[PDB]
Write a protein that binds this ligand. Structure first.
Ligand SMILES: O=c1ccn([C@@H]2O[C@H](COP(=O)(O)OP(=O)(O)O)[C@@H](O)[C@H]2O)c(=O)[nH]1
Ligand SMILES: O=c1ccn([C@@H]2O[C@H](COP(=O)(O)OP(=O)(O)O)[C@@H](O)[C@H]2O)c(=O)[nH]1
Ligand SMILES: O=c1ccn([C@@H]2O[C@H](COP(=O)(O)OP(=O)(O)O)[C@@H](O)[C@H]2O)c(=O)[nH]1
Ligand SMILES: O=c1ccn([C@@H]2O[C@H](COP(=O)(O)OP(=O)(O)O)[C@@H](O)[C@H]2O)c(=O)[nH]1
Lengths: 444, 443, 443, 436
């Protein structure tokens, strides 16, 4: 553990967990690692996860930063993660005192994409080689990467968007917010992509077989230094879960439902899947988030209904809250996965080879579904659209759930992805060799 | 894009730059604000500290200016004297600006520092912009000063500025016409170097000064950009609000004469006599000591105990810094008395307060004219120059009464208030221009 | 870039734009360029254009001449009074020219003031040149007007200039044929001052006007140099064609009537009706204000709601200024409707865009004649001087449909574009002269 | 107390002490007084006096000018001129002055200053009416004669001999002439002039200045002491009988050589006068002076230890002179001191070392205030015998007429000091003139 490295996730479970994963991974490869967190955390969950991680890994060290107050309405409405990410920039300078005192000077720092522009000054005064880890799809990341020239190019939204060395992305996959220049979200991505130039390398949670077209497209696309790190290894946070029912079930019989760290859909729609879930007869494990964005704000299982919970009393079990998704997904009993297609959830399923039913709700998740379908890892119906854009059928959903359980071709293809994913983590694997090579390059 | 703001001395110069800087930061530019020490007035120093603690990501660049060194520019004013001191030392900042870790894309300089600042970034890759504290109408007079000085052989009536109504000779300040005085030398020296500036920022909206903004555009300053009204950085802890809450809406008349303007000893007693005689409710900010806040160490021994007792029911007299923008927003204030320094004037317009115009020194008279033109307030030209003139209680009181009860003004003033709102809106020109400007900054 | 060159355009977009292009051309070819402008500019557009030029082309310096008060009577034209107010202050170029660092090796002056700078080129011996913005056939008529207006001054079917196709009197403006009008005096006097010039550049080439170049060479202008077509300057933008991107190639008709408004409102509406009948997809740039950018405040009141809605999915209208050269260059544009201002005509040939000719005033009719001879466009003679006649929509529609479907025209038009390039290419005849002129200039 | 006023002395206690008294006097008369001082101060004493003054008068404000980079006192007077502009900020921030009273030496520099920040200005002269005219008539005199004559005449003033006149002042080349001549020219700007004199002391002198174009001269003499109270010092003063003690002070700077000083020290014991002697080591600098009383010799101290006391350093002169014990004064005759003697009615012996003082000695003689020997002359020029001195020294103790003449002079001084008298009247009037 001669080399000293830090990783600095900003906000959100999707951002936070992987970086921890990168750190544990880095520690495993003889790196000395500090993990930087900024408080107060947006969600109760983020700290809960963080606390365990440090307890679980003593060798890795916690490096908190306390946030200063801010009040800017320029950011549209009130979504806390952009606000949290924005606040982090306001207090980012507070970082400098913290880095100056590090015992063995940091060889490199790994920084979440959202604040790559603020850190840059910090990265010139203290000359730290700075790296980034991408939580999104390489195909989706390819879109952001080419966004600035594409945003400069036109004023209206066309039928299909062409990123230069990649298959054109349908506009339906793209978020509205991305398209309009005036909107801030556009501002945050554009500036940050520019800051990539300063960075020594860019790391993404995907592997070359997995996104062959995109990774190369990125290569000639102005993102030369991108390294396919993924799939990010398990956090090894053992353990906090009781699953007597899961053990009883036959291997690959049970269906797992998670819509991500945040809730994805309306109750009326939600009841529709529950009704369709009954029609399918799949044994299930369902994790439900009452609060669409914050764990702290949810004190609501009223939404599914009284009759349904008793009706599926022996068919399935549901958790209202947080459960270990990878711990559950590695179980022999789980054979199908219905996800919101956040890239971390999609990547974990590919690593464990669990067939996916893609049900993207917002953001980059629609683009990840296209990768899920292109990979052959999962089944996706593009026509479902964004959440609340259309109300998709109980009867319609049931046919798709029945296909995932009884389509053997998906199982053979899903099995291949697990083998493809495993091979890249083997000593001869490009992903393991790239991580090992990057660690070798870090200076004393 | 890194932008640096270089305000000169004075809360009139200081307040606008910080306000914009906060606006720039809100809209996402990396912002640095340049301050130098010492500062003439306590408020500027106290304010800067407050502003930075409220806005953490804005960098503070502090330089100690060289000791006052001079020859020429007859100056009897402390704030103007400090401006000369900042201007003579701006050329020593070239070494510091060259090595800044996040290099500046552009500098937004103060009008007074524009000539020295333009020379400073000549061989550096930094765009030079200037923010104008005053009104657009005054800028037309500034542009015409060389023509005004050359063909000004006769002391008669007013001079017709080329694209708008002629200004009375009484409105032009006598100091502006004397080349020896600092006010004239600085105005002339800066206008000559305005052509080396990428853009000139102004605190007026297109609705407020359509003729003045248009006249300057065709008069050689073709890069003018209206961004007004500037928005408050809304940072404040001390509350002096309580008396007002007791007051009925619109009853109170607010009197203030800016950061560094004081009345005559005969005028303070005649103004006080008028406030009693009028019978109006009022809020008085008393700045008897003079410009500097530190030396104005007196504490209401200007009027005496007898007067406070008589007026306590209808008035509160405060000596010290008051949160002007907040007071103006209050339901209670239905009148304002102003020296018509532009920043007060803009605030009156944004918050729709009827204004009673009372110039004491410099641009105030022209701005007073603008205020009258737009219906914002009533101006009495005959009163002429405060500090050169004395007005009796009878005259003052009647005007005070008249402004409070002009419903046409209250209706008229509101209309300006609406227009100021529109411009800030995304459609509205002033915000749009800044949004237009901000993109430009990215290079 | 050793050689020091200054070009002076007096007024009008048509005069201003070509001169800027010549300036850019000179700098690219190794001259060091000063550009002289006279303010206040008649129009907002020249100023808009000039500021962008200097910011885009920053190695070229800007020399400005502030104009003095003028008052002569006998309202003519705003660009003709500005052309005569620049000659009332043309002695103000003396101080400026004497101060210039690398002294001028040659100055290029607009033809309107060649008689007034004659004296200035003797005192400071500047080899002076002039660039003509009209056609080579219309300059021939301009260059023989003095000798034609000595004989019986009247009108015949055709008036003839020495060695070129006789020009009809229907193409010649009526004010050029009366010797007591302003026009003639300025043309006669400036053609007399062409003998003091070292060269006379025109915006054309010899394939386009073979007879005019020799007619002008064998009639008193032996030092005439055709350096056409003038190259394009930069501008940096393009949020003008979101619809242009969606439209298919060569399918869009571009309607421009020049820097200024042309036809009467009643006439325009028939074209608008005409456009509709044709089905041509179109991009239309409408200038409401017939002569002044500043004066035009009309909007949707030119064509009516009725038309704008119906063509809503098939055409777009831009009011004011558009980057005409960039638009024409676009793959989408397939036809050009022009007032046949010469500068516009040379770019259409340069860009190979087919023309429907609707000359409105002045030299435009002769230019229309040139367009016909070249094979560049379709022209109807009988349409006449603008507002002389009212042209029915049906007649307008037919020519337009004919333009869309006329294959020989495209082939001939395509052929013209190749030739224009041929001249521009380094071996090229027009290219050769400009390169040569610089070689002559002495440091 | 409405009016607000400021004083500015550049250097020497010759000017500062009077100015402060001017400052205190002005405060008494209802004036807001600000005293402007120059730093660093040339002398530790000069610095010493200022701290005491503000501390003693709480209500008098102090404003200071820090200074940017021959005689130290003269050169510094020159330095203040360099930094005069520094004054400009100070005036601008003032809580504005109804008038400023400024030192004669730097009046020329300030003229520009007064005109921009409109302030009526005055100067106060610490030298005699007879001497001021010599400065006052000097500029014409230098150009017109350019020669050396036994005596020189100022228009309405009895001519005083060259012997009195300082040599340097005579030379056109010298720095001193430029300062004096230039400043008088600047004298035109001031709305008043003040000298530490009263008409009675020099009716002839005051008139000539009035005659000679110094129409605005105002004599406000004698200036009231600004003083500390109360210190139990000089138990050696209270002990002695009235008028038994001779107090010797050659200046606010040293004036004579150790051997020349030894002759007076030997003369003092022969004279028999009881004495309190203020002995300064530094010829011109208090900080420079680091010598003990070894110029007089150990022997002198043992012999006279009961008879008299020697103070090395500074003492409060007005405080000492006012004492009953003092009956004789020996003075270098600096005017400020001479005026103090007249107001306190203490007989003087005049031994002027340098400068204006010899002329000052002449005034004392016309007055009858003290006994003077002209022949002794400029200090260190000649050696004056111990035997010769005592006879004059004894004569000062035992002359009845002198006591009478001196008694009147004190009486005359008071009358002007009182409300009816002109010096008081003008002060009242000038303040009245002062406009808020
Ligand atoms: O109950 C839950 C919900 C989510 N996750 C983890 O949350 C991470 C982030 O999910 P993703 O990136 O797919 O989407 P997000 O929640 O950020 O929208 C993934 O590692 C999931 O395994 C988990 O472990 N348990
Ligand atoms: O007691 C005061 C006096 C002034 N101001 C602020 O100072 C600003 C500038 O004053 P202005 O430019 O109107 O006058 P000036 O001080 O420049 O003469 C105004 O917006 C006021 O809000 C204040 O907050 N409290
Ligand atoms: O909307 C316009 C109109 C004109 N032009 C250009 O400006 C010049 C004006 O055209 P021209 O002089 O031929 O016509 P006129 O000036 O006589 O009306 C031409 O070079 C055009 O290329 C342009 O860029 N945009
Ligand atoms: O030991 C001393 C010597 C002098 N003085 C004061 O010195 C002042 C001015 O002295 P003067 O100008 O007469 O002499 P100079 O300064 O020119 O030597 C008088 O007010 C004295 O009271 C004093 O207080 N103590």
């Amino acid at each position: 553990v001669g080399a000293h490295i830090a990783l600095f996730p900003c906000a959100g479970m999707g951002h936070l967990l992987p970086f921890l994963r990168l750190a544990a991974m880095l520690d495993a490869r003889g790196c000395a690692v500090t993990v930087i967190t900024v408080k107060p955390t947006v969600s109760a969950a983020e700290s809960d996860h963080l606390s365990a991680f440090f307890t679980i890994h003593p060798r890795i060290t916690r490096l908190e930063f306390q946030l200063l107050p801010y009040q800017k309405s320029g950011l549209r409405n009130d979504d806390p993660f952009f606000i949290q990410m924005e606040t982090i920039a306001t207090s980012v300078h507070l970082l400098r005192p913290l880095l100056s005192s590090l015992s063995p000077p940091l060889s490199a720092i790994v920084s979440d994409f959202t604040l790559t522009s603020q850190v840059t000054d910090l990265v010139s005064d203290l000359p730290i080689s700075t790296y980034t880890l991408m939580t999104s799809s390489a195909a989706f990341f390819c879109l952001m990467a080419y966004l600035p020239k594409l945003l400069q190019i036109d004023v209206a939204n066309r039928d299909a968007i062409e990123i230069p060395d990649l298959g054109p992305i349908s506009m339906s996959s793209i978020p509205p917010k991305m398209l309009d220049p005036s909107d801030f979200f556009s501002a945050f991505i554009s500036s940050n992509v520019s800051s990539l130039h300063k960075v020594k390398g860019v790391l993404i949670n995907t592997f070359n077989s997995f996104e062959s077209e995109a990774i190369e497209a990125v290569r000639r696309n102005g993102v030369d230094h991108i390294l396919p790190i993924g799939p990010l290894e398990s956090y090894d946070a053992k353990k906090a879960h009781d699953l007597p029912w899961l053990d009883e079930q036959p291997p690959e019989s049970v269906l797992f439902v998670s819509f991500g760290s945040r809730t994805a859909l309306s109750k009326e729609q939600i009841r529709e899947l529950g009704a369709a879930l009954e029609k399918s007869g799949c044994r299930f494990l369902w994790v439900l988030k009452g609060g669409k964005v914050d764990k702290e704000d949810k004190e609501e299982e009223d939404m599914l209904g009284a009759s349904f919970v008793e009706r599926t009393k022996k068919k399935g079990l549901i958790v209202k809250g947080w459960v270990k998704q990878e711990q559950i997904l590695a179980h022999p009993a789980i054979g199908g996965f219905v996800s919101h297609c956040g890239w971390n959830s999609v990547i974990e399923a590919a690593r464990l080879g669990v067939p996916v039913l893609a049900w993207p709700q917002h953001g980059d998740q629609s683009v990840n579904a296209g990768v899920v379908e292109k990979a052959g890892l999962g089944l996706w119906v593009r026509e479902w659209g964004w959440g609340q854009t259309k109300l998709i059928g109980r009867e319609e959903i049931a046919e798709k759930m029945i296909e995932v359980m009884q389509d053997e071709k998906l199982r053979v293809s899903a099995g291949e992805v697990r083998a493809k994913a495993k091979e890249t983590r083997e000593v001869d694997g490009d992903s393991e060799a790239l991580l090992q090579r990057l660690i070798h390059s870090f200076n004393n």
